[PDB]
Amino acid sequence: PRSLKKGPFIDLHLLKKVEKAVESGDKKPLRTWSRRSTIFPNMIGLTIAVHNGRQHVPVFVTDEMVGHKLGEFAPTRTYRGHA
């Protein structure tokens, strides 16, 4: 976890992107390479396509997802089973 006196972490380009999507008011997805960014409350209800290494998996920001990083909802290593 981060320190509490530092505040929550987000990229500047992601914050500009989500504020552009708020002033634009649309619900079209936006593809990001910013897995290390904490989900903010203004992002709720818009699908974000987070990079997992190959592709961009679209995750829908719910109310309960508002504490975690974006990359926590994008699995990087695929594994099904050894048989």
């Binding site: 995750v59 309960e64 997802m65 975690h68 926590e72 909802f73 699995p75």
Partner: protein, 114 residues
């Protein structure tokens, strides 16, 4: 000798007998008995019933056995229904805090039949 969830032993000291409750350990039992004023040495059997009630309300202050089990199960179910990474690790029965999965994790993965 009857704290609303369970029963406590009578021949243990009051700190160790208080730690039988789900939700208190060493430090919380020390703090509870420091608030209620009972010495840590004396057994439960020498205590009297008004003092057991003045213990009971301070144990009733904290979150203990029933709503603590509800809280823990609700948080783990919240993770598993969230779709996060720790949710999937709680799902498949694998270590969650980034432990070694290649060799060890024989607690979380279960006893080794195969």
């Amino acid at each position: 000798a009857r704290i609303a969830g369970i029963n406590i032993p009578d021949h243990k000291h009051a700190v160790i007998a208080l730690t039988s409750i789900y939700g208190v350990g060493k430090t919380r039992s020390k703090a509870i008995l420091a608030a209620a004023g009972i010495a840590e040495d004396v057994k439960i059997s020498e205590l009297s019933e008004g003092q057991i009630d003045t213990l009971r309300d301070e144990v009733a202050k904290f979150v203990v056995e029933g709503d603590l089990r509800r809280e823990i199960s609700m948080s783990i179910k919240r993770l598993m229904d969230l779709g996060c990474y720790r949710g999937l690790r709680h799902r498949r029965g694998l270590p969650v805090r980034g432990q070694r999965t290649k060799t060890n994790a024989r607690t979380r993965k279960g006893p080794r039949k195969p």
